[PDB]
Amino acid sequence: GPTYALVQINQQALFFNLMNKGAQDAAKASGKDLVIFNSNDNPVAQNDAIENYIQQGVKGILVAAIDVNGIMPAVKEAAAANIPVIAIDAVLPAGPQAAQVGVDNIEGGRIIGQYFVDYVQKEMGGQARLGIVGALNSAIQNQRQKGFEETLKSNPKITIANVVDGQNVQDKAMTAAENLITGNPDLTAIYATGEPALLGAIAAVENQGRQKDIKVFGWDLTAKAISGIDGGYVTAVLQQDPEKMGAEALNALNSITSGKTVPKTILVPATVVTKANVDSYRPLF
């Protein structure tokens, strides 16, 4: 049977397909047989697949959980069978998993914030009036917002016009961003905490014809964000590295099964994407 199994969310999103690639490349490069289970957005099938791989005597399991609470009985079953489990992307609650691979969202906010501060100094005359489009219903995006805001203290001439809630839905983000723009004629920049907020902010800037004088910063590349980078009004987009997450997770299983230590948490850095480095991402979109 297979040596390792990766229990995956779906194969529609680029993020998961890149994670698959990273894990499979690392398996092939280390002479290991990895099978990947596409659960097609079905959390029950994730649980059942884990049980199946336990019965098959796999040597290690990777999981990107849909339901971080609902997956735990199956994770615990793997532990009772002495099969190491590494979680990737979604953070599981405390349990017997050997490691968690993922991103530090606060720190990602800090990294694009530091870029923003330098950009303000170099290209915006050392002062900016910022609006934020967040997602109040999102733990992750609230952290992304917090980390960005922390960096801004390094330039007291960056001040906040307002903070609005895009509700993690592109249309609501667009409406919110449009009212943010019309309400604040002095606004010169927008930070968006995730893909729907970023797409909504982009659409608002375009709808208001403000491509020349509002600079947009945010998270999660899309073809639309790339078009904005090429058009000059999307300045920087923070992009996660799921391929490296998959590679790190697989290599960690090799370490564990070899009898060697691995850290309980493996944080994979994100990349700030600008005009300078967007070319390397073009083939993915």
Provide the binding-site residues for Mg ion, judged by CB under 5 A.
Answer: 118
**To the nearest whole angstrom, how small is the minimum distance from the Cβ of residue 77 to Mg ion?**
49
**To the nearest whole angstrom, how small is the minimum distance from the Cβ of residue 197 to Mg ion?**
24
**To the nearest whole angstrom, how small is the minimum distance from the Cβ of residue 108 to Mg ion?**
17
Show the tokens assigned to 64: 């990107």
Q: Which is nearer to Mg ion, 41 or 118 (CB)?
A: 118
Cα torsion 116, 195, 193, 87 to 10°: value is -110
Residue the block writes with tokens 């001040």: 159
43 in Cβ contact with 70 (< 8 Å): yes
Give dist(CA 61, CA 252) in Å, integer.
11
Q: Which is nearer to Mg ion, 68 or 124 (CB)?
A: 124
CA–chain centroid gap for 266, Å, is 14
**To the nearest whole angstrom, how small is the minimum distance from the Cβ of residue 118 to Mg ion?**
3
Q: Which is nearer to Mg ion, 115 or 281 (CB)?
A: 115
**To the nearest whole angstrom, how small is the minimum distance from the Cβ of residue 43 to Mg ion?**
43
Q: Is 220 annotated as a binding residue?
A: no
Name the residue whose CB lies closest to Mg ion: 118
Give dist(CA 100, CA 20) in Å, integer.
16
Residue among 90, 99, 97 nearest 73 (CA): 97
**To the nearest whole angstrom, how small is the minimum distance from the Cβ of residue 107 to Mg ion?**
17
Q: Which is nearer to Mg ion, 121 or 184 (CB)?
A: 121
Q: Which amino acid, residue 244?
A: K
Q: How far is CA 145 from CA 1, 94, 148, 166, 282, in A?
A: 45, 25, 5, 13, 27
Residues 6 or more apart whose Cβ sits within 8 Å of residue 92: 65, 68, 71, 72, 75, 100
Give dist(CA 130, CA 251) in Å, integer.
42
**To the nearest whole angstrom, how small is the minimum distance from the Cβ of residue 104 to Mg ion?**
21
Residue among 221, 194, 198, 199 nearest 284 (CA): 221
Q: Which is nearer to Mg ion, 157 or 282 (CB)?
A: 157
Q: Which amino acid, residue 256?
A: I
Q: Which is nearer to Mg ion, 7 or 237 (CB)?
A: 237
101 in Cβ contact with 112 (< 8 Å): no
> How many Cβ atoms sit within 10 Å of the Cβ of residue 211?
16
Q: Which is nearer to Mg ion, 118 or 230 (CB)?
A: 118
Binding-site residues for Mg(2+) sit at: 118
Binding-site residues sit at: 118
